[PDB]
Design a protein around this nucleic acid. Sequence first.
RNA 1: GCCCCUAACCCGGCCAUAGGCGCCGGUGCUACACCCGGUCUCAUCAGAACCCGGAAGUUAAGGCCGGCGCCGCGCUCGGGAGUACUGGGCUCCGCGAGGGCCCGGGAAACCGGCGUGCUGGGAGGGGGC
Length: 178
Amino acid sequence: MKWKELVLVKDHPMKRVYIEKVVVNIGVGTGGERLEKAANLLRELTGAEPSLRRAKRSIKDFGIRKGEPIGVAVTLRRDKAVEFLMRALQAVGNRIKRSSFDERGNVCFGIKEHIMLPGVKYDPAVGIWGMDVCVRLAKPGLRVQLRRRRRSKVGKGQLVTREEAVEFFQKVLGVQVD
RNA sequence: GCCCCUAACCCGGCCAUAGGCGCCGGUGCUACACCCGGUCUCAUCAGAACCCGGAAGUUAAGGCCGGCGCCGCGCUCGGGAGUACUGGGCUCCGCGAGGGCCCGGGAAACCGGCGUGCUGGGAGGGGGC
């Protein structure tokens, strides 16, 4: 059950649906050392180097200025995504609300604290952290909207829909969708 | 080499008749793609992108072509209209602000109709010198 064989194939070879990428985010308020603990958690949780996310504006009521890092997110692809996604689903219990699916084939669910994930330990040093896990599904041909030269729009029939997203999570990932 | 003809590709000019939304078809030897990988050059949180090496799969998408509808847009077309406005003249009217006549120019909105990219160079392909 690896990334290359996790594919929902319909009656056309090029209309297959796969996990394009999985993005894990942690929104911490201000601190660097507080961020540093969250940055260390993501590196050891996912095995991938997380990137600091800087504030887009200066919000006085949150005590954040534009340009300082207030976020740590890492995007996961191919096999690191599938491996971590399986753990994340277990921490929730193979349950995802139906309303959590968007019309364009994105699924995001939250993790209130990271201990429910298998393979992690309650540590009084890192503390307790929440997580946002977003999964993107894509049919082949998404490069048409992302390449540098001759960028254009992908046809409507080649885009992942909400119904194809729920089916992928149920039929391929074996997840209870409610 | 040379001349002529000629799809999709490359470099352009004008920059919507070229744009936008929806629907229905065509195209795949080659060309364009989607596509397959990340040893090497290069790259990032991330081989997603960029870059490199390829050729199993596919015309589902992009590109290009044809048709229909609506919006937007365009037109040296009809009306609007010789209307609005206006250069020159006046012992012409009006209490007056202003109007009128003669000679010379002359719109716009809008309504209807038509249109919905045109074109330069090159590669490739065909024919001859």
